[PDB]
Amino acid sequence: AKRYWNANLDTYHPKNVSQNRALLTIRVFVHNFNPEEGKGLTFVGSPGVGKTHLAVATLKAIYEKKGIRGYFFDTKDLIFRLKHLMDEGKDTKFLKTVLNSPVLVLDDLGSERLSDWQRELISYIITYRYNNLKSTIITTNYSLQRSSVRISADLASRLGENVVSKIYEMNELLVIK
Ligand SMILES: Nc1ncnc2c1ncn2[C@@H]1O[C@H](COP(=O)(O)OP(=O)(O)O)[C@@H](O)[C@H]1O
Numbered sequence: 001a002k003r004y005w006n007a008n009l010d011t012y013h014p015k016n017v018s019q020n021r022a023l024l025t026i027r028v029f030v031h032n033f034n035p036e037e038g039k040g041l042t043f044v045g046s047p048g049v050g051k052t053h054l055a056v057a058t059l060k061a062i063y064e065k066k067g068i069r070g071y072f073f074d075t076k077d078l079i080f081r082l083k084h085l086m087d088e089g090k091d092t093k094f095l096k097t098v099l100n101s102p103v104l105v106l107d108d109l110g111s112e113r114l115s116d117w118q119r120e121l122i123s124y125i126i127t128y129r130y131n132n133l134k135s136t137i138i139t140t141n142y143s144l145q146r147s148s149v150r151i152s153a154d155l156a157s158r159l160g161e162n163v164v165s166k167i168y169e170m171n172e173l174l175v176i177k
């Protein structure tokens with residue numbers, strides 16, 4: 001939660017054209033935000049680049065100018081949590097509040113490779129939020145450099161074609177450099 005205590009659309013000081021465009025987009029996005037549209041953003045990019053900073057920021061600006069409460073998860077942390085209350089088998093309540101969330105930040109959704117069972121949980125959670133028009137914000141890592149659709153196949157390679165295709169029809173792509 002709070003290495004990003006300070007994370008605000010407002011500390012925000014962009015340092016290249018990438019970051020400025022990203023901040024403009026985010027601003028427009030938050031201002032027209034409608035839990036109902038199930039629209040989101042995807043932040044790609046090498047690391048230490050302020051992708052996650054911007055996603056926390058986006059989540060805050062939402063509920064500051066729209067009073068809607070999001071949720072912020074490290075994708076692996078979420079998955080790991082869920083598998084464990086899902087085979088202890090008791091809590092359907094955590095799963096439901098995560099799936100039905102009006103805004104959800106899946107930080108690092110899928111950088112690195114995901115074993116069959118984490119793959120299954122992601123596909124589930126994304127199929128659900130896709131079907132139910134639930135706005136979902138994603139940050140993922142991309143590294144080899146000079147776009148659109150390689151970023152597609154690269155993401156597709158550890159997430160699956162299916163999840164990535166859906167991610168695209170829900171989210172606008174913001175490459176931060
Ligand atoms: N433009 C910026 N303004 C303020 N802080 C930033 C900016 N870019 C990066 N940071 C800070 O740098 C650190 C790393 O950023 P992070 O969001 O984790 O990048 P990434 O998620 O791309 O790895 C964070 O603590 C974040 O607060």
Ligand SMILES: [Mg+2]
Pocket residue numbers: 051052107108139
């Ligand atoms: Mg990050």
